[PDB]
Amino acid sequence: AGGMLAMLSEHSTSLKLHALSNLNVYAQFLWPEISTSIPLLESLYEDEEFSQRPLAALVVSKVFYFLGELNDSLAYALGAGSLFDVSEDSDYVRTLLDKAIDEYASLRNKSAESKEEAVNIDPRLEAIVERMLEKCILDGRYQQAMGMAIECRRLDKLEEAIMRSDNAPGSLAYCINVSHSYVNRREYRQEVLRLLVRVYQKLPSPDYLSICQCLMFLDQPEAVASILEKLLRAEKLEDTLLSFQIAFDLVENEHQAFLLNVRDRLSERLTKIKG
């Protein structure tokens, strides 16, 4: 309607914002008329005196979404701040969230290649990805939160997603498998494995085998020797059998330099383990 666009040209800034909200409800049907008047809505978003800037940005972002220009739609959706709710089950919000995660993962991947150019990630884009990861964690969809955390290169949210999961050993085994199949970079794979070793040590029943396998991928014989020494000094016969099982499983992987370095760092059971 050219009546709402005419109301945006009037000096009553609040009434212009009301016309913009009227075009928002109607953005799905009236986007072809509103697209001709984008420069007027952009000028209302740039105007510092306007208290309803986020609503102008939200109308602009919806118009760019219907135009198919998702990058500009995302830039204006980031401008809308609190009016862009991640809780809304709208096709507009889903497509922009998917695009926001993809752009965020792309920028994080590039920022890790260029050790010399800190690509300035918009803090608003990070805050949307945070809220989405928190939503996935609240929904009990830990596997999805872990996938997104790995793509986003965010180790802290990966630790949060694992520690909240009802099935800690299943989530960790999934993380190990995903880290081997999808993480093409060695440096980042080692950082994920170092985080997994820290998470495994916080658990009440540490799976010492999965820890020793992760430590073997990290080439850290010091940590394995300390775990074997702790298990050997335990009074329980079960912890001693577990130490021997770990020793057999380490030998099955045939990394001779690692096995010799583990052996030489070990300060009747000790003779059996050395054998």
């Binding site: 596997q143 999805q144 996938g147 999934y174 498998n177 995903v178 199949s181 999808y182």
Partner: peptide, 30 residues
């Protein structure tokens, strides 16, 4: 597991992607 279907699908798609250069090489060598 739920995220596995997407990760595996991406792995296979990426693997098939190199097939473009693979075929292009033979299209000229042939």
């Amino acid at each position: 597991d739920l995220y596995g279907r997407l990760k595996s699908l991406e792995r296979q798609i990426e693997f098939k992607g190199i097939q473009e250069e693979y075929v292009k090489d033979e299209l000229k060598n042939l």
